[PDB]
Design a protein around this ligand. Structure first.
Ligand SMILES: [Mg+2]
Ligand SMILES: [Mn+2]
Ligand SMILES: [Mn+2]
Length: 271
């Protein structure tokens, strides 16, 4: 009872291996759960182009993801999107908000992704995703997500101006050291839930770090969130921004950690 959708088209990517990382994550889920992914979009090379150029280039991929996600959300399965970049969610979050006006979106990211055309310093579309879905600027793929229904989880070291856009819009922020499973449950209340994860939320490293306090979220904290959200309330999950080359040992190790984090929710949906 899992629908797997995989973006393989460029959506503003500035990193070299996020399309490959999405493909490898999808393969691991196919093998573990006996699934066959629906792959959407054609790869293209990364570039440092302005959002106003990258966004129109991505239209075909974004429309195709929108159509696949809509069909899955209207059905009876768990919708799982394995996305190259967070910017794919410019297509999906408006669908979630329209079909589930009461949903809470847990936007789990080391960043706020809440810049607008006026406030971006780098021009990167990936830094403008949640603000676009909430209608602070027009992505051309809709809006309609209430900022009051969006919760940034794990975000830290946010620029002062962006943090004030977040505050004024009403988006809640739960930093890593507050992001226990219960803190997240308290924020969701009785709502159905959509989980979006950018892996840059995670504390760097895989070695033991028992005597220092982490700056990012630990894998165990993400797993605890997936364990705590009731299966009956979970609409879908997006896994984004694994930068790891195809056929690398690094990608193999990274996807094993991902499977451990998501297993509580995916196991429940499968059975
Ligand atoms: Mg469903
Ligand atoms: Mn992001
Ligand atoms: Mn991020």
């Amino acid at each position: 009872m899992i629908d797997l959708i995989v973006s393989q088209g460029r959506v503003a990517d500035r990193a070299a291996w996020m399309i490959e990382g999405a493909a490898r994550t999808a393969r691991a889920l196919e093998e573990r759960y006996g699934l066959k992914g629906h792959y959407v979009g054609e790869p293209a090379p990364h570039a440092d182009d302005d959002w106003s150029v990258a966004l129109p280039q991505a239209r075909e991929t974004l429309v195709a993801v929108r159509e696949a996600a809509t069909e899955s959300i209207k059905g009876d399965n768990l919708t799982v999107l394995v996305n190259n970049t967070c910017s794919v969610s410019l297509a999906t979050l408006p669908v979630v908000a329209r079909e589930h006006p009461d949903a809470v979106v847990l936007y789990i990211d080391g960043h706020g992704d809440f810049n607008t055309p006026e406030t971006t310093d780098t021009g990167y579309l990936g830094g403008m995703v949640l603000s676009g879905a909430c209608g602070l600027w027009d992505s051309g793929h809709g809006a309609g997500l209430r900022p009051e229904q969006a919760v940034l989880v794990g975000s830290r070291d946010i620029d002062e101006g962006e943090r004030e856009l977040i505050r004024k819009a009403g988006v809640r922020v739960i930093p890593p050291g507050e992001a226990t499973a219960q803190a997240v449950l308290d924020a969701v209340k009785d709502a159905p839930v959509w989980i979006h994860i950018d892996w840059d939320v995670l504390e760097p490293g895989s070695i033991p770090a028992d005597y220092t306090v982490p700056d990012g979220m630990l894998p165990a904290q993400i797993r605890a969130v997936f364990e705590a959200i009731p299966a009956e309330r979970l609409i879908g999950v997006e896994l984004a921004e694994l930068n790891a080359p195809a056929d690398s040992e690094r990608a193999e190790q990274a996807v094993a950690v991902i499977l451990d984090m998501v297993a509580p929710a995916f196991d429940a949906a499968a059975a």
